[PDB]
Amino acid sequence: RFLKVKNWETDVVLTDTLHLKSTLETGCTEHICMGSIMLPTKDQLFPLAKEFLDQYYSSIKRFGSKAHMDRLEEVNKEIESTSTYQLKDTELIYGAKHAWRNASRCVGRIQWSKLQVFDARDCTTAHGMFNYICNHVKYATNKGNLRSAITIFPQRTDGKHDFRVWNSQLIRYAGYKQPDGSTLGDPANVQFTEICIQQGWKAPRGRFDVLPLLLQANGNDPELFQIPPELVLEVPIRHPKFDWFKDLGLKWYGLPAVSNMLLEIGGLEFSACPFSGWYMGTEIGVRDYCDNSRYNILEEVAKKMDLDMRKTSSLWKDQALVEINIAVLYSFQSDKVTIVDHHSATESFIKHMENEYRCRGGCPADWVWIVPPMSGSITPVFHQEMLNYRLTPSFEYQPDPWNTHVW
Amino acid sequence: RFLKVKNWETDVVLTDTLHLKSTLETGCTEHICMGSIMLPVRTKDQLFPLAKEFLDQYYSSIKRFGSKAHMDRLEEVNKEIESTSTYQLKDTELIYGAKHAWRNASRCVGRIQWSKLQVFDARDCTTAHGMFNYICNHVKYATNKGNLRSAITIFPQRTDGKHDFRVWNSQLIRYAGYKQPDGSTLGDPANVQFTEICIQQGWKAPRGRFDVLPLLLQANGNDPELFQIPPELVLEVPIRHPKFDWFKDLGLKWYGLPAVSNMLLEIGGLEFSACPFSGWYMGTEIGVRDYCDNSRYNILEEVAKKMDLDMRKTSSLWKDQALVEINIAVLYSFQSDKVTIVDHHSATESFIKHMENEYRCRGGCPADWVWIVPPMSGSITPVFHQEMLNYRLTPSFEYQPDPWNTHVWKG
Ligand code: HEM
Ligand code: HEM
Ligand SMILES: CNCCN(C)c1cc(C#N)cc(CCc2cc(C)cc(N)n2)c1
Ligand SMILES: CNCCN(C)c1cc(C#N)cc(CCc2cc(C)cc(N)n2)c1
Ligand SMILES: C[C@H](O)[C@H](O)[C@H]1CNc2nc(N)[nH]c(=O)c2N1
Ligand SMILES: C[C@H](O)[C@H](O)[C@H]1CNc2nc(N)[nH]c(=O)c2N1
Ligand SMILES: [Zn+2]
């Protein structure tokens, strides 16, 4: 019932008690581990509210106080009467920070308490959503000195009035299939890119076209908006040693901003809750640049390095991979845009885990996602046992809206 | 019930039904995933169902399920259990058993090869000297002058738990580790405790950076005895780099034969506590783990120095750079000396083809993603993108506690 995790590099053993407060299910059973699978009413609501308000009043050292009891009372009355309830600003902020704190797949969580929360619960239209999002983008970007932020649109009601950002990230590049059979730009967004086209976006049909926002307010049909280009900070990618690198014509955007997730707080569902921080270098250089189903540039780079691409055992892919990742880091650093390398981020995460074990009794962590996609075992997270479990408040996956929405 | 796995690079979706045959626990529950946790005497009572389940599997595999031969064998094993409280495997069942434990080994990327395993039956062995002889023969056979052949040697099964056969070494071939009075380590830090035991038992330590350890062998619950493997039988590869001529002067070598000797083989409820097995290396085991773990040889610094990389900030990715070169060097050295080795790209591609074949022919392939994905360049290998299901099938290889922690000393 009380569980131990060991670091095999340092022998440090930590004891996890926080898991016993776990709520949602993992996908695993005693017979089958699903650790590597990517996606495994009035009655129901008050226990959820109570569990949340209990953790909130505990956090501000007011558990069992009149104000605690009075709020539980007030929320109970409001659910009984309205079928839902509204969070106080203080609860909203606490909830959103804790959803990040509880994100088991996030290596960046040492930062969890410095999150700027933008309350957009007064928003009613897609133009309003566009405005909130431009403001979030500019605040977070901060001329390259990135600051973590979340913007929270109105919560789900009857479920026919959902607010949604259809984009998977606030800032992403277009993808287009051609007669050629291949793909121009980002192949991950081909479908979304065409949804934008079929909605009326005039695509410049290039390799790095910032997609328009497709915003859905109050369950209405989503609408298109171009983010002011002056708000989209982008970085040209060069290498500190290879002068030819720049001629590949690679660039990426400074702001990583997930916009398709659902934020659950005290049983309330916030279906539009875009959040952003700053990149770990490997996200762009390993995943975005080198995944076979992404920009897939390994082959071209290896060629310019004149490596032996004859046999896999020359490790030409591995060599190119490192160089590409050195370039990403160097470019962001040169242009004074916040970025973290995988060594620095994973070391910070170990220190964070230790804080959380010490101060909270644990830290839910998903090893499959935490260990970087390159140089795994030379980062300390590789040797760290982690327990994965689901706490609330949380960020959850939700279905893509084009399958759900009724036009 | 059916379970699907998706490859996120190819969108290929596979369907697992084999998990229905899973028995042992994972350590996970609906409330906690223990997927990254490293380590998560029988009665007649529990033994006959385990025997029956095994023999049903064996007999189906030979297309003789429900045959007279099948039935007579069940009855013979049954009678043997109630009479002697255990039973003996026929040679054919032992071979099938050992091949299947490998096939079922979810942490093993090399399983495409599972059906080519040379099984050496050492169940007539009675003494530590007898074990030494069997292990020498296994090493010579598996080494095959560099043309490595997979093998397992299987000593007598557990009886009352008081007469266990054990190989105390964790691998048949491994280098000594010595902790110095100043706190530094000479040789392999992983093997310090084991090296000290060997020393206490009377091994004369050369005290260098690459001293091949003696074998410490326990037969029939007796105190273990030391033996030196003939050096002519220990194939080693000096490590050099195809382009960096200073790489050789780092003084590195490694042995060619990876041979796990501390696991327990379970077949039909029987426990084979000494079952050393061997294959050939994937380059990263040596180049990433053995050489570059901080708690192992830890050569990243000295290598990066000699490459004149910028070591002042981690964001230069100097460690990543030194890491790749070292791994190039390991593969180059092995290939140049004609010693079997596989790179992590080749090995993972073959694993995916194996895994797909297994889904089609067997209904599944249990796989531990945490172990299967290589410890460098994870996402540029196809396994990173492959969803896997981890579950436990028998026959199986299992961990067991280190014998110095449990052995009753005779004197
Ligand atoms: C401060 C800089 C941050 C860094 C360096 C960071 C790091 C990362 C990395 C490397 C991943 C894996 C992403 C992938 O492979 O797709 C990740 C996932 C995640 N992060 Fe963080 N993060 C940061 C800020 C945040 C913030 C501010 C939040 C929420 C407010 C957050 C919540 C999550 C969630 C929910 C996931 C999983 C998303 C999914 O499952 O696709 N991150 N983060
Ligand atoms: C044929 C060449 C082979 C290759 C390239 C191969 C590859 C590997 C690798 C890379 C690991 C992870 C090792 C570690 O990190 O400690 C492993 C684990 C394993 N392999 Fe294979 N293997 C091969 C043959 C075999 C054979 C012949 C058996 C038994 C018959 C076997 C059974 C296992 C077991 C039981 C584990 C888990 C070890 C543990 O949990 O510590 N392997 N193998
Ligand atoms: C799905 N994961 C692999 C591809 N990568 C690297 C990836 C894809 C998408 C999308 N859509 C989004 C991300 C961003 C994840 C993230 C979020 C935040 C707040 C910060 C950060 N550094 N990364 C990363
Ligand atoms: C414990 N895992 C990391 C250290 N490594 C790489 C490691 C430690 C020990 C031991 N003892 C043994 C091995 C060899 C595992 C193995 C076995 C076989 C049959 C083939 C193969 N390629 N590797 C590897
Ligand atoms: C199948 C496997 O779970 C999938 O490839 C995962 C592995 N680990 C990951 N880790 C991170 N951080 N991000 C990812 O997208 C993935 N993809
Ligand atoms: C804590 C974590 O499970 C541990 O470091 C694992 C990770 N993956 C591994 N994978 C392999 N092949 N071998 C290992 O020793 C490990 N170690
Ligand atoms: Zn699990």
Q: Quick one: A41 and A143 in the same domain?
A: no
Q: Please, are residues A185 and A194 in contact by the beta-carbon 8 Å criterion?
A: no
- Ligand 3: residue of A169, A189, A371 to mutate (most ligand atoms within 8 A of CB) is A169
Q: Please, are residues A79 and A46 in contact by the beta-carbon 8 Å criterion?
A: yes
Q: Quick one: A224 and A252 in the same domain?
A: no
DSSP string, B3-20: EEEEBTTT--EEEE-GGG
Query: Which candidate from B9, B323, B390 shows the least CB-CB separation from A33?
Result: B390
List the structure tokens of A73.
């009372």
Q: Is residue A383 part of a domain?
A: no
Integer angstrom CA distances of residue B88 from A6, A372, B265, B407 = 39, 48, 14, 25
Which residues 6+ apart lie within 8 Å of A14 measured at CB? A4, A5, A6, A353, A354, A357, A362
Which residue's CA is the closest to the ligand 2 atom numbered 36?
B108
Using alpha carbons, select from A344, A392, A136, A174 the residue that is nearest to residue A256: A136
Q: Quick one: A129 and A83 in the same domain?
A: no
Give the nearest ligand 4 atom to B282 CA.
22
Do B376 and A376 lie within an 8 Å CB cutoff? yes
- CA B364 – CA B355 distance, rounded (Å): 8
Which CATH number do you get for residue A133? 3.90.440.10
- Resolution in units of Å: 2.0
258-297 in chain B: CB under 8 A from chain A: 283, 288-289, 292-295
**Bond preceding residue B395 cis, omega within 30 of 0:** yes
Q: Quick one: A34 and A152 in the same domain?
A: yes
Minimal CA separation from B12 to chain A, in Å: 13
A368 lines ligand 6 (CB under 6 A): no
Which CATH number do you get for residue B291? 3.90.1230.10
Q: Is residue B10 part of a domain?
A: no
Using alpha carbons, select from B88, B111, B96 the residue that is nearest to residue B60: B96
Put simply, whether B389 touches A (Cβ < 8 Å) is yes
Residues of A identified as active-site = 106, 109, 278, 283
List the structure tokens of A8.
């095999």
Which residues 6+ apart lie within 8 Å of B375 measured at CB? A376, A377, A378, A382, B284, B288, B289
Which CATH number do you get for residue A28? 3.90.340.10
Which residues 6+ apart lie within 8 Å of B183 measured at CB? none
Q: Locate all alpha helices (DSSP H) within B62-191, ordered by sequence.
A: 68-84, 91-103, 128-143
The backbone torsions φ and ψ at residue B123, rounded to the nearest 5 degrees and listed phi first, read -75, -10
Measured in angstroms, how far is the CA atom of residue A34 from the centroid of ligand 7? 5
Do B32 and A378 lie within an 8 Å CB cutoff? no
Q: Which domain holds residue B227?
A: 124-149+164-235+399-403
Put simply, whether B2 touches A (Cβ < 8 Å) is no
A33, A39, A279, A367: best mutation site toward chain B, by most B Cβ within 10 Å?
Answer: A33
Put simply, whether B333 touches A (Cβ < 8 Å) is no
Q: Quick one: A330 and A245 in the same domain?
A: yes
The backbone torsions φ and ψ at residue B212, rounded to the nearest 5 degrees and listed phi first, read -65, 130
The experimental technique behind this entry is: X-ray
The residues after which chain A has a C–N gap greater than 2.5 Å are 40
List the structure tokens of B137.
């023969």
Which letter, b or e, does each residue of A68-95 get, where b requires 16 or more Cβ atoms within 10 Å of its Cβ? beebbeebbeebeeeebbebeeebbbbb
Calculate the dihedral angle through the C-alpha atoms of B241, B242, B246, B251, rounding to the nearest 10 degrees.
Answer: 30
Taking CB atoms within 8 Å and a gap of at least 24, the contacts of B24-28 are B24/B392, B24/B394, B24/B396, B25/A30, B25/A31, B25/B392, B26/A28, B26/A29, B26/A30, B26/A31, B26/A32, B26/A33, B26/B390, B26/B391, B26/B392, B27/A30, B27/A33, B28/A26, B28/A28, B28/A29, B28/A30, B28/A32, B28/A33, B28/A35
Q: Quick one: A45 and A153 in the same domain?
A: yes
Q: Is residue B331 part of a domain?
A: yes
Q: Quick one: A202 and A135 in the same domain?
A: yes
Q: Quick one: B20 and B156 in the same domain?
A: yes
Do A315 and B294 lie within an 8 Å CB cutoff? no
Q: Is residue A4 part of a domain?
A: no
Q: Quick one: A48 and A154 in the same domain?
A: yes
Q: Quick one: A128 and A226 in the same domain?
A: yes
Put simply, whether A317 touches B (Cβ < 8 Å) is yes
Q: Quick one: B198 and B286 in the same domain?
A: no
Q: Is residue B410 part of a domain?
A: no
Q: Is residue A205 part of a domain?
A: yes
What's the total number of domains in chain A? 3
- Ligand 2 pocket at CB < 6 A: B 102, 105, 107-110, 113, 117, 150, 152, 260, 263, 277, 279-280, 282, 285, 342, 347, 371, 397
B8, B281, B380: best mutation site toward chain A, by most A Cβ within 10 Å?
Answer: B380
Put simply, whether B59 touches A (Cβ < 8 Å) is no
Q: Is residue B379 part of a domain?
A: no
Q: Is residue B138 part of a domain?
A: yes
Q: Please, are residues B247 and B241 in contact by the beta-carbon 8 Å criterion?
A: yes
Q: Name the helix (H) or strand (E) containing B353.
A: helix B344-362
Minimal CA separation from A67 to chain B, in Å: 33
Minimal CA separation from A84 to chain B, in Å: 28
The C-alpha angle with vertex B281 and arms to B275 and B285, in degrees rounded to 5, equals 100
Q: Please, are residues A254 and A233 in contact by the beta-carbon 8 Å criterion?
A: yes
Provide Rg for chain B, Cα atoms. 23
The C-alpha angle with vertex B341 and arms to B136 and B205, in degrees rounded to 5, equals 45
Calculate the dihedral angle through the C-alpha atoms of B96, B99, B103, B104, rounding to the nearest 10 degrees.
Answer: 70
3-state DSSP assignment of residue B371 = helix
Which residue's CA is the closest to the ligand 6 atom numbered 13?
B371
Burial of A202 (0-12, 13-18, 19+ CB in 10 A): exposed
Q: Quick one: A23 and A36 in the same domain?
A: yes
